[PDB]
Amino acid sequence: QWALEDFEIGRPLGKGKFGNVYLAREKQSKFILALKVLFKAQLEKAGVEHQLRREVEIQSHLRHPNILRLYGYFHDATRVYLILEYAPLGTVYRELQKLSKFDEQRTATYITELANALSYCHSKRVIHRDIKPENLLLGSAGELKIADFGWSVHAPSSRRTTLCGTLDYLPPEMIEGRMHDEKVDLWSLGVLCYEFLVGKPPFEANTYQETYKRISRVEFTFPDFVTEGARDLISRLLKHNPSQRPMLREVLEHPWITANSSKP
Ligand SMILES: Nc1ncnc2c1ncn2[C@@H]1O[C@H](COP(=O)(O)OP(=O)(O)OP(=O)(O)O)[C@@H](O)[C@H]1O
Ligand SMILES: [Mg+2]
């Protein structure tokens, strides 16, 4: 349905493992969007041609205001192009670098949007598994949008696919190569909540082997400015036992969330 000559390419929006994301405009409608470019050679070498099929299949059939839209795809002989909704206020990763940390109001609002979006995914037995600040984008009204469904799968799942990045947002069960379900995203929510308030994830380290030990043992401490209410929600989500992690409804109902989350 689409080809490269249908778009006017603009500036790079960001960079990923298999290529860049560019701002683009559809020549006929003048529709501004983003094009995620992936090199075929790289996907073959890494053996991630599946995963890319999953990202397209899963994300194309999701419709939620806090989930980034995947309008379609196309390809040539060398590259694969994903047609995405353009998020104009960038990443939560960049916002965090600018502010250093976020207040309870901004944190609680982001956690609400994330829990709402994850509740919709989990209803369709879709587990994201790669909820990282670089994958959380911002709409024109500054609302959070979950993006990058490359690691998404239908639950329950095991993993043969090896992890090549930081272990900071991954639960003990994923790190150990064990079985897992939707409770993986509940752990990631707790890691993000801590990082939004503190400015660094609770198991950050100089080495991968050290991070693994901290995650495996659930070895974290709160700075003095973290409030009782915030400590309570983070400590409820960062449970070694996946079955002990709360339901997303309990996250949305938490007193600290209700008290600081901005109302639409
Ligand atoms: N629609 C978009 N609007 C604005 N910026 C975007 C958009 N999509 C991606 N970006 C930017 O490009 C970066 C890379 O995008 P993305 O997470 O989709 O790629 P990836 O990490 O390489 O993919 P994968 O995990 O599937 O292998 C983002 O972190 C962000 O900075
Ligand atoms: Mg990414």
Author numbering: 127 to 390
The study reports:
Aurora A kinase (AURKA) is a member of a family of Ser/Thr kinases whose orthologues control progression through mitotic cell division. The localisation of AURKA to microtubules in the mitotic spindle is mediated through its interaction with a protein partner, TPX227. Besides localisation, the AURKA-TPX2 interaction modulates the catalytic activity of AURKA3738. Here, we report the identification of AurkinA, a drug-like inhibitor of AURKA, which binds to a pocket occupied by Y8 and Y10 of TPX2 in the AURKA-TPX2 complex (the Y-pocket).
To provide structural insight into how AurkinA binding might hinder formation of the AURKA-TPX2 complex, we determined the crystal structures of the AURKA catalytic domain in isolation or when liganded to AurkinA. Interestingly, depending on the concentration of reducing agent in buffer, the AURKA kinase domain crystallised either in space group P6122 or in P41212. Analysis of the AURKA structure in hexagonal crystals showed that it remained relatively unchanged when the ATP binding pocket was occupied either with ATP or with JNJ-7706621. The hydrogen bond between Q168 on the αB-helix and the main chain carbonyl of K143 on the G-rich loop, observed consistently in the apo structures, was lost.
